[PDB]
Amino acid sequence: MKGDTKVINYLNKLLGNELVAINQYFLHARMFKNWGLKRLNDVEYHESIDEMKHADRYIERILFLEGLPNLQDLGKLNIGEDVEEMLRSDLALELDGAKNLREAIGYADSVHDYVSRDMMIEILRDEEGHIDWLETELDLIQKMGLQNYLQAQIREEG
Amino acid sequence: MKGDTKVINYLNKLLGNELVAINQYFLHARMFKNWGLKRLNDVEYHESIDEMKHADRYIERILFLEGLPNLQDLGKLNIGEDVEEMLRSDLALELDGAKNLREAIGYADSVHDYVSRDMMIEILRDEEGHIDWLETELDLIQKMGLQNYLQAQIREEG
Amino acid sequence: MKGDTKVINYLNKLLGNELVAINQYFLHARMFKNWGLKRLNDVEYHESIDEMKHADRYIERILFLEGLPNLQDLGKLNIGEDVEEMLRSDLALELDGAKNLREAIGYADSVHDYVSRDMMIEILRDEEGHIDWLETELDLIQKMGLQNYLQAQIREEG
Amino acid sequence: MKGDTKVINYLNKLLGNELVAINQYFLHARMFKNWGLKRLNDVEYHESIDEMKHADRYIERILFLEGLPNLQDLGKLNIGEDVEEMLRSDLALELDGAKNLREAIGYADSVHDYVSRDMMIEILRDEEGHIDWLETELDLIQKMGLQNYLQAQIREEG
Amino acid sequence: MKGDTKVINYLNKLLGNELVAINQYFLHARMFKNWGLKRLNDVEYHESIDEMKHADRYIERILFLEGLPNLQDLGKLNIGEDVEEMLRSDLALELDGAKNLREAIGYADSVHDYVSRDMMIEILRDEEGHIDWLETELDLIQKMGLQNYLQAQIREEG
Amino acid sequence: MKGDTKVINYLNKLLGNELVAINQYFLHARMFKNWGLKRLNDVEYHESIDEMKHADRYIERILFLEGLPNLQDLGKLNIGEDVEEMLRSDLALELDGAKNLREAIGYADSVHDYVSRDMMIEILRDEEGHIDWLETELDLIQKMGLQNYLQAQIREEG
Amino acid sequence: MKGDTKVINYLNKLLGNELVAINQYFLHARMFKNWGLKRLNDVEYHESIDEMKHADRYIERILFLEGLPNLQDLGKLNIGEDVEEMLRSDLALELDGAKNLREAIGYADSVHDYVSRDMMIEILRDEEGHIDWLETELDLIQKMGLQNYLQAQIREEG
Ligand code: HEM
Ligand code: HEM
Ligand code: HEM
Ligand SMILES: [Mn+2]
Ligand SMILES: [Mn+2]
Ligand SMILES: [Mn+2]
Ligand SMILES: [Mn+2]
Ligand SMILES: [Mn+2]
Ligand SMILES: [Mn+2]
Ligand SMILES: [Mn+2]
Ligand SMILES: [Mn+2]
Ligand SMILES: [Mn+2]
Ligand SMILES: [Mn+2]
Ligand SMILES: [Mn+2]
Ligand SMILES: [Mn+2]
Ligand SMILES: [Mn+2]
Ligand SMILES: [Mn+2]
């Protein structure tokens, strides 16, 4: 079905954001894994899989709307050297994505693409949830201290 | 454990190949899906997941060997406009990867990194398997004709 | 138990026929498999296993009758280059075997070896069944056309 | 996929070895069976089926590598007249096959056909296992004496 | 089957390494157990059992190859007085074994003993895995501090 | 808890005996296995595991009693060249161990270490049981003759 | 049955020791419980129940031996004010009981009351086990520090 051109560009810009989040969350998960920090490996791997699934939703909507998914442009990953710096790059990436999402949702709404808009509010709701996890971890590091925080990651939660 | 520097570069060059195969196989799967070609969507999606799992094996080996995984450089995707052109870009990508793998396996062997070498022979064995599927499909297109070939893709196999 | 010498030679001549049918049906099954023609791989592999089991019945009867099984002389395989030519070499091999069987059954009967005779009528009944499958396929190729025939082989029957 | 010509010849030379092992192990199994030596019939029949499955692996690899399987040339079977002579022909055949395999594995490795090479190391591992069984039986015949050895074969093991 | 003499010596040298690892890992497990450090007792006991099973693989290969297993020469155990010193003697023993293994694998390969070679790459892969556990523990001790590290060992993981 | 010094030395002398029994019973089991003598492999492997478990009981008692387990001194193994010679070295080792145990039990009793004493009477009871098996086998070899005895070992008991 | 008078007095002296251990372990369990230290409540409550069951064994043996159980004399409880002081009073009580037990076991043995003697070696074995737990806890308090030790007691082990 023929979509609005500027909705298709927002969808590609947003898909482009997911492509860096997938790679950055996946490499952080495996870095935490290699350090023995199992709980951090499991939560970050899951966030990686969520972004994978978001990228898949945009690829499919762009194709239905008769656009072309751009999987060729990868933005700049910010890895970090320690646990706290790694969790802050992630919080910062999420905060930018949420910002681009707010803008795209408002545009899709103004051109009456209500289905693309609802897709994006669902993805925004998942991003606000990752933002909540990252903020609480970063605070817990300050409150219990890094050595206590690292000790809490070596066994997995349920 | 400290790995050989040139083994760590081969592992990153190879990881870099998987990153384009993941994106190119995933976008081809979803293009076939949008066209109604369900069987082709299912096989190409599975190949995408295999490359995902290969990329994960290299990320973990590079980290143990004390190197840094490069998830920042994405090579050039070659998408294609029709079914046959899409399957040929995939066969060509696989044929190059197999070529780089043969070279890396030989080097890892000469520096006695037998575990990195065996990991790569396993991945090479999976790639030869994707090469076999792609070659047979491309031949079947010539033998039964494209309209018959497209008709065979609209329901999924088991 | 001491068998009739000429019955033991018919049994070896017939065993010799099964040894080429086993190899020719097995190589055709794997050729069809490599071409993507799964239904043809499954039926020809099964015919190969039937001939295997026939060869086993003759080996055991020749040994009871105090003869020596000849597994050393392999006749000339006629492979074929395409689907239709491959199925016609098979039909032709079966038609010759059935001819040698008719002759051996009549001889075993005239020397009163009724058990060797009944063994051979059972094997003849299986060969007439392979002849029926091969003839119907060769006719279906003419009636629906080769491209339609090849399309029907890519998924397996039940 | 196009294979190295000399790898395809080693694969055919090896397939040719399996074709005599299949026939020689199968006829020995049925000879032991006719003599009442059930345990020897069961182990030799199983070795026959293993060679069958090895021959199938080579036929499929040669076809993928774009060669032609040679199922037309059967080498010379060495049957034997008694139990010990029969088991020694088998040990001798296995010892030759292992020798040709060592040579082919080294060549496949030097042309970087690591998947054909690994296939052959797996088959070599099964052949070393048959070599172990045959050597132990031949020693047990000397240690307990032939009449005791024959008595041990009349019921099947588990 | 008659093996290469120098392969049989590498196999005995390597068996000799496993005999000290078995005793050193077993005594460390029981020392950690006596100190209340249950998680460390369980992981080190399991490593002890792996070495037991490796020693068993070499004993059986040397016997098939017609050599004699040397279970009479025990090298020098390095026990350690505290947790960190104990884990570093283990890391150091593993690093030496891996070094002797790399050398033996290359020799077995050059004499074409591909089955003894593959046995050793499998054992090398298990040793690289123990090396990974030991390195991560030694780093976690530095990152969370010894009192936090000791507190994490008093209950067992799953 | 602080143990008596001479009790801790008896416990180490005894642990030292178990370390040769473990290695001598394990190598005899695998030699019988390689010869085809399965029943003898299973019983001797089990005796090896019992000694393993005895060595573990002494290591743990010495540690509680505040001593140091000596796993560094391995005595002289007496392997043997044939079945009967191998079983007699085992009977002789057991007979010595039982002798050292009788002496240690009496000493532990005189210093009132009743728990170390009871541990040792339990281990003595297991050793008298291995002595019974070895004596009966050695007699059965004389009564039925070696060729009959070897024939009885080729299948496993229950 | 009429017992030896001095065996009956040792049995009452020992029963008298269990009566203080029951009360001291039970009050310590409930004190740890009230402080939130659940793991310490569970282990000390179980030790209390073991002493209960020991007191029951002595009451029954004294009655069979025709003596009178003395449940009227309670010795002096040493409670303690903090966690470490409480665990040391317990270790000290156990160490005295073990001392009286060693003496009684030797006397019962010299008058040939082998059944009363074996009853007491079983109880001694349980007391050495409580001694092991108490010593390891007291060391863990020094090694991980009291605040880490108290944090580890707030959830129960399995
Ligand atoms: C173009 C970007 C990618 C897309 C669109 C994508 C999509 C997916 C999807 C849809 C799944 C299945 C999710 C589910 O469980 O329901 C998946 C799984 C997975 N992906 Fe990706 N992925 C991408 C990139 C990557 C990369 C770079 C890696 C990193 C190595 C990766 C690793 C994985 C892994 C390990 C799994 C789990 C596979 C399994 O065992 O099932 N993916 N991905
Ligand atoms: C002397 C000729 C041969 C005889 C007498 C023979 C006999 C047999 C028999 C009795 C079986 C078991 C049939 C059943 O399932 O009940 C069998 C299975 C089989 N044979 Fe043969 N065979 C012969 C040659 C071959 C050859 C040349 C190949 C080709 C590679 C082959 C491949 C197989 C395979 C793949 C199976 C199935 C094995 C399994 O997975 O169970 N056979 N054969
Ligand atoms: C010549 C060296 C040794 C060899 C070849 C050896 C081999 C084995 C094998 C094959 C097993 C069974 C593994 C399984 O669970 O699958 C085993 C178990 C065991 N070994 Fe050893 N072992 C050796 C020395 C020792 C020593 C010195 C000790 C230390 C006291 C020991 C203690 C044990 C224990 C406790 C088990 C578990 C037994 C059970 O409950 O099943 N082993 N060993
Ligand atoms: Mn997202
Ligand atoms: Mn997110
Ligand atoms: Mn790949
Ligand atoms: Mn691939
Ligand atoms: Mn037939
Ligand atoms: Mn037929
Ligand atoms: Mn074979
Ligand atoms: Mn074989
Ligand atoms: Mn090892
Ligand atoms: Mn190891
Ligand atoms: Mn013992
Ligand atoms: Mn014993
Ligand atoms: Mn008590
Ligand atoms: Mn107690």
From Swiss-Prot, chains A, B, C, D, E, F, G:
Effect of residue 57 to K: In strain: ECOR 30
GO molecular function: ferric iron binding; ferroxidase activity; heme binding; identical protein binding; iron ion binding; iron ion sequestering activity; oxidoreductase activity; protein homodimerization activity
Effect of residue 52 to H/L: Loss of heme binding. Is still capable of accumulating iron
Cofactor note: Binds 1 heme b (iron(II)-protoporphyrin IX) group per dimer. Binds 2 iron ions per subunit. The catalytic dinuclear iron-binding site within each subunit is known as the ferroxidase center. In BFR, the ferroxidase center appears to function as a true di-iron catalytic cofactor, rather than as a pore for the transfer of iron into the central cavity, as found for eukaryotic ferritins.
UniProt cross-references to SUPFAM superfamilies, sorted A to Z: Ferritin-like
Enzyme class: oxidoreductase
Taxonomic source organism: Escherichia coli (strain K12)
Domain of life per record: Bacteria
Reaction(s) the record says it catalyses: 4 Fe(2+) + O2 + 4 H(+) = 4 Fe(3+) + 2 H2O; Fe(2+)(in) = Fe(2+)(out)
Cofactor(s), names only, from the UniProt record: heme b; Fe cation
Protein's name in the database: Bacterioferritin
